Structure formats: C-alpha cells, structure tokens
Design a protein around this ligand. Structure first.
Ligand SMILES: [Mg+2]
Ligand SMILES: [Zn+2]
Ligand SMILES: [Zn+2]
Ligand SMILES: [Zn+2]
Lengths: 257, 48, 477, 44, 115, 64, 98, 35, 49, 192, 40, 240
C-alpha cells in the first residue's frame, strides 16, 4: 500500500553520459523518470533573437533557429534562474535571462566560419558548451552577422532545444522473462548488453509471477547539464510536480467538504 | 422464338428494343430488371 | 553499318532498317527520331573491351570521352525502327555467355537495363520491388517534393518557391541519381521511420511525426512569394506612381496601416507583414489622387525578404517584392517516401511520447502498417532495411533496380553484423507507459519528402463574405 | 532611402522623383536596404 | 495559423483549476480527478501507485485527447476508504519514493566520483 | 544547406562535426570509420553526417 | 535588321555558352542549371516535344466505321522546305456495298 | 582483353557516366535549337 | 483526329528504352504526356545527300 | 477507443520479415514455376507440330492461349497457396488479411511467391514489335517470359523485361481509374 | 465470349439504343435436344 | 446579348440557380482523430472563429449571449455582429462599448461557432446520402478537419491530402433538420443495400481480430486501462 524502496547502482559516469540501474521500482515510476529527463528538466537556451545585420546566405530565422539549438552551460545557474513569465521584470532581466551578442564581419578571401565561439554572453556562468565549436553560418567576404539574443529558462516539453539529453537509453527485463515482447523466433534476436543468458539460450524461462523491475538507464547529455545533474534535476522536478499537485489537491478536497 | 424445338418461354434477348417490340412494355419492365440486376450483381454487389 | 560505325559518310543518328521479308532497306536521316545507345555485339562478344573501360576511367587528363566509343564502333545509336531488326542482349554476363542456346545471334547489348527509366523514376530505390502504379505515383510526387530547386535561388524572384532548410541526400540511392545531380540538390530528408500502429493517428495513409525532431529543423522549409507591381503612365489623365498615400493628399484611403511603407511607397526588407498590411503604395491621379495600393492576402504572414526596383521590358518603373515565410511541419502537411506512400501528418508527439528503442532512438515518422499490404511497395521495406545497413555501415546504399548483387537476404545478413535483427525489426517501448510493445516494430532510415501541399495554403472559410454587385452572390475578397 | 546596386553593390540615396539608377555604375536593378527597425525572432 | 503556443501544454490559463474532483455516481466510493496541464508523466505514475493500494478497487487514467492537456484519473476504493484519501496517500508514497531515489542517486554519484 | 546543430532523432550535437568529418575523410578514413572517430554511435546521428549536403559552400560562390 | 529570335539558354547563341562554372556563378547563374528553355517576359518557358506521325512513310490502316476497307496514307514533306505537309490517301473502297 | 562479369558492373556505369559527361540531360533541347 | 483512331494512353512495347515506362501524369493525361528515358536521344536531322 | 489503446500494448507492424518465406517454401514455389514453364513449352511444341486440336467455339490461336493461360494461372494459384501456408501465426501480412483490414490472398502471394501474368486488354503482352514483345526475345516467342509472365515476387524483384511488362499491365489500371473518375456521377446526374 | 458490362452496359440500358454494342440471345431448348448434345 | 446571359453551363438558370457559392462554408484538409465520436468533426479554431451562428436572444441565454458580445471578435469564443429587432446589423469589433451593446429579447447575436454545433460535412464527389452527413463541431488546436476513422468509408475519404467541405446550418429549423435526418448515426445503415455503410477499419479491425483471439489475456492493470475508454461502462469490473 506504500512507496517502493528503490535502489541505485551507477555503472558508468562520464562528462557525456551516465549509465545506472534502478531496482525495486515500478515500471510507471521508471518510465516517468525517463520522460522527465527529456521533457521536464529545465536548462537555458536562446529563445529571443534580434538580428541587427545579416548579409549571410541564410535568412534571419534560419540563423535564429540555429542559435536556439546551441547548448549553453546551465548546470548551477539554471536552478537560481527564473522563468521570464514568473519574473516581474519588463520582459527581460539578469534574474530570468542571459544576454548574448554576436558581431562577425568577414573581410578576408577565406570563408569565415561563424561558430558558437563567436557567441558572447554577459553571464560567465552561461556559455556555449563547446567553449570543436558549433557552426552557426559560413560568411563570404563582405558578409556580416550582427545580432543580440537572450537565453531563458525552459524545459523540453515546450521546445526540443530545452531538452538536455542526447539520447536516453531505457531498458528492463533484457532476457524477456516477463514475455512483455513475444519473439516469433527468439533465436534471431541479439542479446541485450545487460543480458545474463548463455550463448545457446535465447530467452529466459517465462516468469509468470515476475514484474518489471531493475530498469537500466543510459542518460547521454547534450552538454547543458552534467549527465548526473539531469537525473538529480529530474527526480527533484518530478517530485515538485507531485508536491504541487498535492497542494492543489488539498485545497480541492477542502473546498468539496 | 417461333423456331421448332426452341423454348418459347425461357428464350430471351439482352436487347431491350427487341423485347419491347416482341413482348411488350411489361416484358421490358421485367427484362430491364434482369439486365439492370445482371450488371449490378456481376461483381457480386447487391442493391435493394 | 560499317560506315556509320566508322563515322565516315553516315552520321551516328542515321538509322538503316532492312525488312528482310519485305525486301526493303529504309534509311532515315530526318529529325525527330528517338534513339538510344546500345553496345555492339559481334560473334557473341562485346566490342567493348577492358582497354575501352581503362581509357574511360581516366576520362579527364586523357581527352577520351563518349564520342571515342562511338567513333571506335563499340557503341551505336539505335532508333525504334532499327530496334525491330536488332537482337538485343539485356546483359553480357548472362545473355551471350555460353549456355543453353536460346539465341546465338545477339547483335546488341544493353549498357544497363535501368536506363529505361526517366529522371523522376530514376530516384525510386528498388523500383523493381514495387507495384508498377506506385512507381508512377512517385514520379508524380517527386516533382512536388521540397528541396533546393536551384542553387542561385536567392538571386531569383519567383512567384512561388519552396526551400528545405536541411536537404539530405538519400542514404539509399540509385546509380542514375549521380547524373540527375540529386545528390547536389536533394529534395527530402532521411527519416527514422517506424511502421507501426501507435495511437491510431496514422490510419488511412496518415503519418505521426516527432514533434521534437520538428523542433530541431526536421523538414523545416522556407516559402518565398514574390509580388510584382508596375506603374503605368498610359492615359494623360491618369498617372499612377509609387508613394505611400497620405490622408490629406488622397481622397480615399483604407484604414489599413501605411506605416510599413517607406516614402517611396515600398515596404522595406526585414519587416513583418500580414493581411492588414500594404506592401506596395501606388496612387493614381484623378482626371486629390485616388490610391490603388496593393494588399497581401490574409493567409500570408511573412517577412519582406527582398525589394528590387527596375524598369520592365516596357520601360515602366516596377518593383518585385519577395516575402519570406517559414513553414514548420504541422498536422495536415503531406509527406511521401519514394514509393508512392503519400500521407498527411495526423499528429505530432514529443520525444518522450514517441516509442523508443533500447538505445533511446525514437522514430521521426510513424506510418501505418496497413499502407504496405495493398500497395505492395516492398521496395519501401527494402529501402528501410538497406538504409539501416547504410547508416550503421557508413556507406551509401545502392538501390539500382536490376542488380543481382543485392537482395534482401544479403542486406539482412549485413544488418546482423551490427547487432540488429536481420529483418530490421526492433523491440520498441511505449513512450506513454514505458512497457515493451509485444510486437517488434520495423524501424529504420527511409528517405521522406515534404510536398508543396501545406494545409495553410488550403484552409479557407467563408461566412457572410463580399458578394458580387451584379450577381449578388459570393465572391473572393 | 538607400538603394543597393545589383551590379556593384553601391549604396546611394535616391529620391522618389529622380530616376532609379546607379549613380556610378549606371545599373538599372536596385535593391532596397534592410530596414533599420528591429524585428524579434524566437529561436524556435 | 491555428498553431497553439507550446506553453499551453503545462501552463494554466487564468481561471483554470489544476485538479477537480467529481463523484462517480455509477459506483459507490468512486471519484473522477480531472487534472489540467498534465500528461502521461503524472497520470501513469499516480495510477500505478494507486494499484499498489489494496483498498483501491479500481485505478485508471486517460488523456481524453492528445491535443488537449487533461488527464482523468478514476479511483474506486473500498467503503471504508475514500478515493480522495487514496489519491493523497498515492502522492505521498510517490514523493517518498522520489525523495529516497534522490538521496540514493546522490550517494551513488559520490561513490563513483570518489573511485 | 548547412549542417544541422542537433541530430533530429535524439538531439545530439552534430553541428561541430562536419568540419572534423571532412578532415577525417581527407585523412583516408572510411565514412564509417570517421563517424566512429567522431563519437556517432546511434545510426540516427550517423545519418546526419552520412547524408548531409553542404550547399552553403556553393551558395558562397555568389558575391553578396 | 528583320527581328529578334528568342534564345534558348546555355545554347551556342546564348551568352552563357562555354562559360566555366566559376564564370556562371559570377553572373548569378546556377552551374547545375541545365538551360534548354526561353525567357519570355521574364518567364522561363520550356517547349514540350510534340509527338507526330512520321512523314514520307506509307502507312496502311483499316477503318471499320468508314467506307474504305483499307487506306494507305503518306504525309509527304520536302527536304527542309515548304513546312506544310501534304497527305495523299490511296483507299480501297469497302466491300460492304451491295 | 575482355570485360569479365566480376568487372562488368563497374565497367557499364563508367560507360554510362561518360555518356552524361558528354551529353547531359537536356541535350535534345539545345541540339534542336542550335540546328 | 489521329489520336482518336488508336488509343495512345497505353504503354506500347516500342517505348522501351525511349520513354520512361513509369512516369506519366495521373488523371485525364495518363499516357499522353511522356518523359524521355535517361539515355534516350532525339535525332536533330541531317541531309541525306 | 478501447482497442486503439490495447494496440498500444500489443502493437502492430509490417516489415521485411513478413515478406520472406522458408527456404523449403521457396524451393516448392521454384519447382512449381519450373514445371509450369515446361508445361507451357510442351503446349507450344504441340501447336508447332500441329498436334493441338482446337476446342469447340475457339480457333487454334484461342485454344493455345486458353491452354497456356490456364497452366500459368494454375501455377500462380499453386505457388500462391503454398506461400500462404508457409506464413506463421505471427506474420503481419496474414494478420491484416485475416482480419480483412487490408490486403488479400493475391497480395500476399505476389509479394512472396509470384507476381504472375501481365495482361493488356485481357490478353498477354502483345507483339508490339514485329512478332516480338521486346527486342530481347526471338520472333514468335510464346513462352511465359516473352509474353509477360512475371516469375518473380516483389521481394525478389522483377527482371528488366518483367519490370516493363508489369508497367504495361499497370498502365491499364491507371487508364481505367481515369475513365471511372470521368464517368463518376454521369449516370447519377442523368437518372436524377 | 464477351458481352458489355459495368458502366457502358449500364449506360446502354438508360440510354436505350436500337443497336446495343453486343446484341445477343439466350435460346433454351424444350425437347430432347436440350439433354442431347448431338440434337442441340 | 440577353440570350448569351442565360445560355451556357454558367448561365443564370444553371450556373446561378441550380448551383452557386454559399456563405458559412469551410474547406480544409482532413486528418484522422480516433478520439472523436463518429458523429463528431474536429474543427480548427480559425474556421470556428470565422463562421458564426445567429442565436436569438432569450431570457434563457440573455446573460450567456451578453458575455459573448463583450468578448467580441478579439477573444474566441465571442461574437461578430448584433442584429436588433429592427433587423439592422451592428459590427462588434468596430465599437465594443458595452453601452451600445446591451441585448434584449428578440435580438440575434451572431456568436462564433462553438463545440456541439451541428454542421453538414461533405466530401466530393457527393455520390450518395452518406456523402453529406451531419456532425457535432469539436474545436481543436490545429488547422485540419478531423474525422473518426469509421466515417471515412461512407465518405470514401482518405487521409493522404483529401479535403472536405463544412457547411454550417444557420437557423434552428434547418439545424433541427440535420439533427433528426442527416446526422452520422442515423446514416449507419443505408437503404441502398439494407446494410451498414460504415464499419470497423484498419487498426481497430486488425487489432480486434488479435484482441479476440482465444489466447489474449489481460492483467488487472491493463483491464482498468481499457475500461477508462469504455464510455458506456457501468462501472463494475467483470469477474475475470
Ligand atoms: Mg486521397
Ligand atoms: Zn526578469
Ligand atoms: Zn552599380
Ligand atoms: Zn541521433
């Protein structure tokens, strides 16, 4: 009738990905965690661009599109940063956004690569992750790109640019003991990297009393957050979603009575 | 139809004009039913 | 025949036909005869030898070209009339090789049987694995796809132009595509397409698109509309000029804002426009001066891309205004593969909602399995399987139609070497619940095309609109 | 009111009344200069 | 032209209730919870936690329409247990589990980083 | 026209790999070997560089 | 002077004839552009090939509806002169007539 | 000497490639107008 | 008049290698609008002298 | 709504694996097609040697074409049934056919076993060339390959001649569709 | 044998014409010829 | 001449009496929506916000129609016009001043199309009765018309670029005509062949075949999920 007592076993922890296993958990909790990784972990991304000059071969909202998709370092600044909607400023201020500036002019016969290294922020905490660098546009001689942009808080549920993950590998029951997937020919299917079966064996014996548990994760980070920071933010974000719902539920129950 | 040893009852034609001038308007009404039914039911379709 | 092959007196395009039964030799030199090059076969052997191929390999820095093959008498053009007297071998390696003597008098050989196809049918991958009408449908859809129609599209000012943000060359391609420059100017994107019934929103030739992929520029495109207006001084009384109308100067002006217009009557580039805005301010002098400015359609909402001012052929000052409008894929937009599988986007799901593999890969597009069985577009399934091997192998797949070196079994065996099910099926997990789907879903990269048909270009409503004065009946306003 | 020549890309201020033509190039195709007004793009 | 803002999926507009409880008259001790601006992330986790309760006879959720952002959770409990009480206990258990997961993931990070 | 910043399928960064990818190919790497050297494991990301057409290069051949 | 002939682009009489790909880019022309069309009042016009029966060839056809059992026609045209083509029929009258 | 079957596929597409290096795809339109 | 006598919409045997067998508009123009095969060539004509 | 949400668990797909058949099934299909070709060859020899007796109501040519067509029609049915029997319960081509949702038995057989005979105006591919269907055959070649019998499946792919004859047969369907669109509602507006 | 069917046959009926495309009869035999092939 | 005006397919008698353009009609692409009822059509907000229905002001709806007038064209759902007892039309968006916008019985408020509004939905060519069926409007947030997958068969419609016409009846008498004669459920069985005209289709038909197999077993959690989508469910979980 009460909560699970899940356990965590981290298998790999690099600057790019974190591989971990969660045990003694329900499938719904395991899945909701991976959905939060993608859709509900806030990071900082450019969501406002004014282009003062753009002589390049790419139109204005092509450049703006590419700017928004550039990952910015938002590990610790994101927590203390506010949402522009929640912030009381006049649509932008240091407490809810980070200003960026790009001013590149090409005056050489060699093609000028406008990369994320040219993106300059007023906040040292929030900088492009690459600073190889991400190419924004290539400039011919005589072409210039001058713009100022603001990076604000958001999560992947609003736009894919606020998704902090570069791929969330999720798995459970690698040997298919639960028979949640039925192979017409189990022998044709490669073994999972987490499989614990012999070479001859193709499926684990059916476990009628089994339940989905021991979920395997591999959270790969785009760069905005550390892969461990994504998981920790996801757990606190999912917890905050439920605590907020409980607070609203309590008032509704009181109003009903 | 007048030919000997030829069924003067079941023998018919798919030409409505020939039926009209030989048997009559009511025969055409029945023949037109059968021609209209035959084309409709050729592919297995059914119409009330 | 000898003279033509030596190009002495008889040019290559001259066709000589002998009707042995009718005792007639017909020589045709006129224009309008359709012919194709065929390899000459003598004594059950190709006159084309390794030495000819070696010289062609060094085509540049050698001056050896196609014309030397014709001059050498190794290949010649055959028109339809002459083709009736020609005993043609489909391939040299099989037809004129020693075997059961079906025919020992071959006179010509095909260079490749896949040259029977035209430009649009030559991009279809594995067209010999599709039902023929579906190859015909794709040839129609290929001409409506989006891409980069021409490299210098910025200089051009066309009434309508669609440019894809991120055109990709197909992962699975045909040898003929090298000559269509489809690689240089591709029209489409390689999409991770899952053939599954996910939530019922891909039924009846509909498509489920990944919203996160769309957010990243997946099948994003530009739409350029160019408007031309010229001012004519014909008629002494009336003299129309470009300038933003003013209330005091002009007797009658609409309540539309003219702030967008410059002092020359032309909106400047880089300005948002909508239906209520005026792009060209043209005023005609009365016999105060009446205004005849041009307005945009309510549907259009873009940014002025370019404004050029010139004198037309007639010598009248006229301006072309190009409006730029970014079209993000949405529900109702038509998408098609290269196999006649055309469909609108039924719904878009974010990456968390989409079904995912063990690696975390979610399909960009999900198509209904019921589209395949009736259409029998097995080439679509083979392209996805070949494309999966291509993306993993790092090699562009070859989908030339009549290639015996490629078959599903060979492609399947390759897919096994990369830790995938040999038939391209994968175990997908439900995005909503995370539970494994009982059936393993066919998923892999397939080249999809965004078609010019957008829903915004089509949606239109009428409710007590501008009837006609004469007929008192509805009309467009 | 600056117009950019299509041939030499010379910026030249042109009045409404005077003929449209490059001052030094003589070219007859002129492009308006980009508006000085600011337009906001959301990087979406 | 009809595209809705991306934030409409998680931001309540003025005068919108996050959660509303309606009694299900078909069966006793049943309630329908209409939660606005929520999706399968909270519907599935809440519903699964409810099923672990032996006093919850029925627990299910649904998104009536993918283009809309409401989840309806139906909970039927035993006569001595309230559907609202089951819902609150379900959330506390999830918060307890998530809090425990945070602590243990933090410990694991220290272990892996330490060596 | 230009390399996308993110892989469409997963959102992995791909915009800083086109120049390296071209450099690796100039180093006689096979296309598959170059992609492996660049960290592109998922075939969705390999698709991004294996099927990219860099039209921005020829667009720069036209004087502004 | 007797008139002006519209010129098919990238043909021997087009200004973009023999120009290298770099030269075409200098003229704001796409090197991949194949040409083969006309610019008529700024509109790029393509001439669609028109399929027609070969001339100077004797063709014997049969028409059931007509009164001739067989008809051997021959559309005769000169060797690049008198564009109009004169057709001669040699028809055998049908045997239906009693 | 002779093109063997193991080399035919490479050989035939070298012939095809040379053909489009010389003619292109709109050679009919341009040749007709030049005449 | 000529097209009436014999139907040209059908794909004739002789189109092989000359006209694409797959490319043809759907609708009223099926089989009437055609496309050259890639290596198809139309003769420009020369004098028979 | 109820089954669209259970299908989220069960799932339904279609792929290359559903278009394959057993090596034994492929051998059986090949034997049937190999024998069917030999049967047509024997019928040709009888006609060539003037040993073919026309049936009542038909000329010698109609008799030969009827005999050849039934042999090839039987071969397609024999191979089509064989391919269907090889399908497993899990096969997704069969699941859509069995439920009636999409496809038919003929679609499965064409994908797996044999596309079959291509017909133009109800007859085999005509001798559009002089006594030939294509320049790649000998004159007066009435064998299945010459006259438009596709011995391959869509999975195996068609040969260049089969591809063209299948295009010829498929053009007939395209023309008929256009006519029906033109005729759509013509009778209705006359009756009304 | 072959007779008109589908729309063209449907067209003929509503468009009653003195000359159908494929006029034909269906003669039935009432004597021993009906069951005797030689007599038929 | 006068004779020319009448002659031709586009003449007054044929081109302007038998057929003619009509107000209050919409057309866009159709996309699937398995979440709608068969008798329900999803409508874009722009189409709904553009097409209006004239509601006669009554004490039953005096306040409700008053709010729509206040909201106006700016906010959807609102209203476009007010028709007084005089029959004169007032354009709301021009002047939203509530003083001039007081309503009273007998006034007609042309409110925007809202959920539950009856419309005639048509796919061309209109070959039989089931080609023009009545639907209940359901506003949805994108730019397409939505159709239940079952009604695609009577319409002969596919979701590969098909477009369908929406006609909005403009009065209570004609609205009641569609409700009682032309709604989709009343069209389920056709008199043409005395059999149903629409049935279960691709995914639901393929899945119901699998679902009904003898060896399909559902766990407690799965059954409770399927019961959430059974609108007619009485609330009692059956004995397993
Ligand atoms: Mg359609
Ligand atoms: Zn602020
Ligand atoms: Zn100049
Ligand atoms: Zn990726």
């Amino acid at each position: 009738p009460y909560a699970n007592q899940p356990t965590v076993r981290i298998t790999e922890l690099t600057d790019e990905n974190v591989k971990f296993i969660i045990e003694n958990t329900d499938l719904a909790v395991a899945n909701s965690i991976r959905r939060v990784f993608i859709a509900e972990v806030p990071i900082i991304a450019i969501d406002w661009v004014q282009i003062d000059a753009n002589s390049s071969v790419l139109h204005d909202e092509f450049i703006a599109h590419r700017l928004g998709l550039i990952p910015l370092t938002s590990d610790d600044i994101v927590d203390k940063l506010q949402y522009s909607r929640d912030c009381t400023c006049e649509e932008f201020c240091p407490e809810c956004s980070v200003e960026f500036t790009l001013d590149v002019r090409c005056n050489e016969d060699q093609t000028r690569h406008v990369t994320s290294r040219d993106l300059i922020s007023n906040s040292p905490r929030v900088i492009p992750v690459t600073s190889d660098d991400i190419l924004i546009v290539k400039l011919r001689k005589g072409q210039e790109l001058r713009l100022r942009a603001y990076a604000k808080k958001g999560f992947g549920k609003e736009h894919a640019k606020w998704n902090p993950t570069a791929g969330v590998a999720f798995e459970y029951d690698p040997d298919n003991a639960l028979r949640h997937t039925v192979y017409p020919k189990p022998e044709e299917w490669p073994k999972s990297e987490y499989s614990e079966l012999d070479e001859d064996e193709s499926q684990a014996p059916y476990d009628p009393n089994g339940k989905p548990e021991r979920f395997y994760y591999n959270v790969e980070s785009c760069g905005s957050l550390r892969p461990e920071t994504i998981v920790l933010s996801a757990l606190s974000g999912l917890k905050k979603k439920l605590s907020d719902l409980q607070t609203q539920l309590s008032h509704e129950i009181q109003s009903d009575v | 139809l007048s030919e000997k040893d030829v069924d003067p009852v079941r023998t018919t034609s798919n030409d409505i004009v020939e039926i009209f001038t030989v048997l009559g308007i009511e025969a055409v009404r029945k023949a037109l039913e059968r021609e209209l039914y035959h084309v409709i039911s050729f592919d297995g379709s059914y119409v009330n | 025949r000898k003279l033509r092959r030596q190009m002495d007196i008889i040019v290559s395009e001259v066709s000589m036909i002998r009707d042995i039964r009718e005792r007639e030799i017909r020589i045709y030199t006129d224009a309008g005869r359709i012919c194709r090059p065929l390899l000459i076969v003598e004594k059950q052997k190709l006159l084309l030898k390794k030495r000819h191929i070696d010289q062609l390999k060094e085509r540049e820095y050698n001056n050896y070209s196609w014309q030397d093959l014709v001059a050498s008498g190794v290949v010649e053009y055959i028109d339809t009339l002459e083709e009736e007297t020609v005993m043609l071998a489909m391939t040299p390696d099989d037809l004129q090789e020693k075997e059961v003597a079906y025919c020992s008098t071959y006179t010509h050989c095909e260079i490749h049987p896949s040259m029977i196809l035209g430009v649009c049918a030559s991009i279809i991958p594995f067209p010999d694995h599709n039902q023929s009408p579906r190859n015909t449908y794709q040839s129609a859809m290929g001409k409506q796809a989006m891409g980069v129609y021409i490299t210098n599209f910025h200089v051009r000012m066309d009434t309508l132009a669609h440019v894809l943000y991120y055109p990709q060359k197909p992962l699975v391609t045909t040898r003929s595509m090298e000559y269509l420059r489809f690689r240089e100017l591709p029209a489409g994107i390689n999409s991770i397409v899952a053939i599954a019934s996910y939530t019922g929103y891909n039924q009846e030739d509909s498509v489920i698109m990944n919203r996160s992929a769309v957010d990243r520029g997946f099948f994003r495109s530009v739409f350029y509309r160019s408007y031309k207006e010229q001012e004519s001084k014909k008629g002494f009384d009336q003299e129309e000029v470009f300038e933003k109308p003013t209330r005091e100067t002009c007797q009658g002006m609409r309540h539309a804002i003219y702030d967008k217009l410059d002092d020359d009557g032309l909106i400047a580039p880089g300005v948002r426009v909508s239906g209520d805005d005026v792009i060209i301010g043209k005023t005609v002098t009365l016999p105060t001066k009446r205004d005849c400015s041009t307005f945009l359609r309510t549907s259009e909402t873009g940014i002025v891309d370019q404004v050029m001012v010139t004198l037309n052929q007639e010598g009248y000052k006229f301006c072309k205004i190009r409006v730029r409008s970014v079209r993000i894929p949405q529900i109702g937009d038509k998408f098609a593969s290269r196999h006649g599988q055309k469909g609108t986007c039924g719904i878009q799901y974010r990456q968390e909602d989409m079904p995912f593999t063990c690696e975390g890969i979610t399909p960009d597009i999900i198509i209904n399995p019921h589209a395949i069985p009736s259409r029998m577009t097995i080439g679509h399934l083979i392209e996805c399987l070949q494309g999966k091997v291509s993306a993993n192998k790092g090699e562009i797949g070859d989908a030339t139609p009549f290639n015996d070196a490629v078959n599903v079994q060979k492609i399947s065996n390759l897919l096994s070497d990369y830790g995938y099910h040999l038939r391209g099926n994968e175990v997908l997990y439900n995005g909503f619940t995370g539970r494994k789907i009982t059936s393993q879903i066919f998923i892999g990269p397939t080249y999809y095309q965004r078609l010019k048909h957008m829903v915004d270009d089509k949606i239109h409503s009428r409710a007590r609109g501008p009837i006609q004065i004469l007929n008192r009946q509805p009309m467009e306003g | 009111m600056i117009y950019i020549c299509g041939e030499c890309h010379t910026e030249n201020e042109i009045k409404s009344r005077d003929p449209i033509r490059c001052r030094e190039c003589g070219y007859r195709i002129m492009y308006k200069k980009r508006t000085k007004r600011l337009v906001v793009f959301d990087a979406r | 032209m009809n595209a809705p803002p991306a934030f409409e999926s998680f931001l309540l507009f003025e005068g919108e209730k996050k959660i509303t409880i309606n009694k299900d008259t078909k069966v006793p001790n049943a309630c329908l919870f209409t939660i606005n601006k929520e999706d399968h992330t909270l519907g599935n986790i809440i519903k699964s936690q409810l099923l672990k309760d032996p006093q919850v006879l029925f627990a299910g959720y649904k998104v009536p329409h993918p283009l809309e952002h409401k989840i309806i959770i139906r909970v039927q409990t035993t006569p001595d247990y309230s559907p609202q009480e089951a819902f609150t206990n379900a959330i506390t258990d999830l918060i307890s589990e998530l809090s425990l997961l945070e602590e243990r993931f933090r410990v694991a990070i220290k272990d892996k980083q330490e060596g | 026209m230009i390399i996308p910043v993110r892989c469409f399928t997963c959102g992995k960064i791909v915009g800083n790999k086109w120049e390296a990818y071209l450099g690796l190919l100039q180093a006689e790497y096979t296309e598959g070997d170059a992609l492996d050297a660049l960290g592109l494991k998922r075939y969705c990301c390999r698709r991004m560089l294996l099927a990219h057409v860099d039209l921005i290069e020829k667009l720069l051949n036209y004087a502004p | 002077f007797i008139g002006k002939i519209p010129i098919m682009l990238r043909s021997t009489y087009c200004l973009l004839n023999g120009l290298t790909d770099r030269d075409l880019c200098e003229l704001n022309e796409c090197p991949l552009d194949p040409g083969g069309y006309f610019i008529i009042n700024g509109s790029e016009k393509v001439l669609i090939a028109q399929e027609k029966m070969a001339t100077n060839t004797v063709y014997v056809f049969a028409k059931k509806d007509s009164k001739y059992a067989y008809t051997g026609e021959c559309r005769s045209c000169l060797e690049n002169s008198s564009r109009p083509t004169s057709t001669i029929w040699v028809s055998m009258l049908a045997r239906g007539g009693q | 000497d002779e093109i063997t079957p193991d080399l035919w596929q490479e050989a035939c597409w070298i012939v095809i490639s040379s053909y489009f290096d010389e003619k292109g795809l709109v050679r009919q339109q341009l040749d007709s107008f030049d005449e | 008049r000529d097209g009436k006598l014999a139907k040209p919409r059908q794909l004739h045997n002789t189109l092989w290698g000359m006209v694409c067998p797959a490319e043809t508009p759907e609708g009223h123009a099926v089989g009437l609008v055609k496309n050259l095969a890639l290596m198809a060539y139309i003769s420009v004509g020369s004098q028979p002298s | 709504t109820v089954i669209n949400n259970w299908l989220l668990i069960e799932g339904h797909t279609i792929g290359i694996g559903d278009s394959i058949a057993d090596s034994k099934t492929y051998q059986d299909i090949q034997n049937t097609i190999k024998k069917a070709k030999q049967d047509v060859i024997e019928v040709i020899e009888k006609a060539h040697n003037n040993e073919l007796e026309p049936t009542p109501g038909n000329t010698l040519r109609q008799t030969f074409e009827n005999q050849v067509n039934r042999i090839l029609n039987d071969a397609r049915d024999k191979t089509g049934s064989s391919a269907q029997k090889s399908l497993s319960e899990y096969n997704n081509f069969k699941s859509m056919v069995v439920s009636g949702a999409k496809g038919s038995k003929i679609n499965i057989s064409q994908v797996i076993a044999v596309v079959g005979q291509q017909n133009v105006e109800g007859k085999r591919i005509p001798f559009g060339f002089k006594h030939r269907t294509l320049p790649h055959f000998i004159k007066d070649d009435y064998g299945p390959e010459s006259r438009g019998f596709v011995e391959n499946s869509y999975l195996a792919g068609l040969t260049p001649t089969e591809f063209f004859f299948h295009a010829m047969g498929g053009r007939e369907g395209l023309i008929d569709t256009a006519v029906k669109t033109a005729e759509t509602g013509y009778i209705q507006r006359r009756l009304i | 044998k072959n007779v008109t069917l589908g729309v063209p046959r449907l067209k003929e009926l509503i468009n009653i014409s003195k000359k159908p495309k494929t006029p034909s009869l269906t003669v039935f035999l009432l004597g021993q010829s009906a069951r005797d092939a030689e007599r038929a | 001449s006068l004779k020319q005006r009448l002659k031709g397919k586009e003449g007054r008698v044929r081109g302007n009496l038998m057929g003619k353009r009509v107000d209050f009609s919409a057309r866009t692409v159709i996309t699937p929506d398995p979440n709608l009822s068969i008798d329900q059509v999803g409508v874009p907000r722009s189409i709904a916000a553009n097409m209006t229905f004239a509601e006669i002001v009554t004490p039953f709806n005096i306040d409700r129609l008053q709010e729509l007038v206040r909201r106006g064209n700016s906010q959807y759902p609102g209203a476009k016009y007010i028709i007084r007892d005089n029959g004169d039309r007032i354009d709301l968006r021009f002047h939203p001043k509530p003083s001039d916008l007081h309503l009273q019985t007998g006034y007609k408020v042309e409110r925007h199309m809202c959920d539950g509004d009856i419309v005639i939905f048509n796919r061309q060519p209109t070959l039989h009765k089931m080609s023009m069926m009545g639907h209940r409007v359901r506003i949805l947030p994108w730019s397409t018309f939505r159709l239940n997958l079952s009604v695609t068969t009577p319409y002969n419609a596919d979701f590969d670029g098909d477009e369908m016409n929406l006609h909005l009846p403009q009065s209570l008498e004609t609205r009641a005509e569609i409700q009682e004669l032309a709604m989709v459920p009343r069209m389920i069985v056709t008199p043409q062949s005395n059999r149903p005209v629409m049935g279960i289709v691709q995914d639901t038909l393929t899945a119901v075949r699998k679902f009904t197999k003898r060896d399909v077993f559902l766990e407690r959690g799965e059954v409770m999920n399927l019961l959430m989508f059974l609108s007619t469910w009485d609330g009692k979980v059956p004995q397993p």
